Structures are given as C-alpha cells and as structure tokens.
Design a protein around this ligand. Structure first.
Ligand SMILES: Nc1nc2c(ncn2[C@@H]2O[C@H](CO)[C@@H](O)[C@H]2O)c(=O)[nH]1
Ligand SMILES: [Ca+2]
Ligand SMILES: [Ca+2]
Ligand SMILES: [Ca+2]
Ligand SMILES: [Ca+2]
Length: 129
C-alpha cells in the first residue's frame, strides 16, 4: 500500500531523496507527502535505512531546535533507539555558522551526528502503513 517509488519495510513506507535540502525544507517536503522525516526505532530499521542511503550524510526526523531531543512524530527520544557516533551529539559551535548543531543525520557509516540544520543533505521520508 506504499505509493509508487516508495520502499515497503516492516509496516512502513520509505522514500529516499536523491537531492539535498536544509532540514526544515526536508521536514516540510515529508509532511506534504502525508509523511515525516524517518524515525528510527530499532537496529533492524537502522540497517534497512543504511542499505538504501549508502555512505552519504542524510537527515532524519530527530532534532533539538527548541530544547531537548525530539523525534518529529512524538516518539520518545529518552527511551528510544539511539545510534550516535562516539562523542556525538556535541552541539558544536566551532563551524562558525551561528548556533550549535540541532539536527540529526546519518553519517557515511550509519552512525548519527548532530549538525547545522541549514546544511543541504539528502533525506528520507517515512509513512506508516
Ligand atoms: N570539536 C570539534 N569537533 C569537530 C571539528 N570538526 C568536526 N567536528 C565534529 O564532527 C562532526 C561532523 O562529522 C561535527 O558536527 C562536529 O561534531 C573540529 O574542528 N572540532
Ligand atoms: Ca520508523
Ligand atoms: Ca543542539
Ligand atoms: Ca556534532
Ligand atoms: Ca554544507
């Protein structure tokens, strides 16, 4: 029951961009497809997403723009799956672009990093069947 060009996996439909957008734009894009930026809640889901994105920085539906870490669909961050890269998240200001780092993305090895929301990265949308 996924739309055409979406990939079905464990009761979810995924769409993998082949272009980049700033996090807020990627967020708006997913919402307009009645979907959200991918919410990763298991090791199995992480591996599935990694397979399709490859070694490329890719936005996910996890951010801390208004304070504590939140998943875009309300999934609790504290008791949920996490796959941060060691020493991440670090809310780095050293990039000199203003602010810390408020948006999460999969890195080239799949592990997560918090980065500057304005960066154009590829993204993944997810909808639940
Ligand atoms: N402290 C520090 N972290 C860095 C530096 N360059 C990159 N990073 C980190 O590496 C991430 C990119 O993979 C950034 O979001 C930061 O967390 C640097 O010069 N200093
Ligand atoms: Ca999910
Ligand atoms: Ca932050
Ligand atoms: Ca970081
Ligand atoms: Ca950039």
């Amino acid at each position: 029951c996924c739309p055409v060009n979406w990939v079905e996996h464990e009761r979810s439909c995924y769409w993998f961009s082949r272009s980049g957008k700033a996090w807020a734009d990627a967020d708006n894009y997913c919402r307009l497809e009645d979907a959200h930026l991918v919410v990763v809640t298991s090791w199995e889901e992480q591996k599935f997403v990694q397979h399709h994105i490859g070694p490329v920085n890719t936005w996910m539906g996890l951010h801390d723009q208004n304070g504590p870490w939140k998943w875009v669909d309300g999934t609790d961050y504290e008791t949920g799956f996490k796959n941060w890269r060691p020493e991440q998240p670090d809310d780095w200001y050293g990039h000199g672009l203003g602010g810390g780092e408020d948006c999460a993305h999969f890195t080239d090895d799949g592990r997560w990093n918090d980065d500057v929301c304005q960066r154009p990265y590829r993204w993944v949308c997810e909808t639940e069947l």
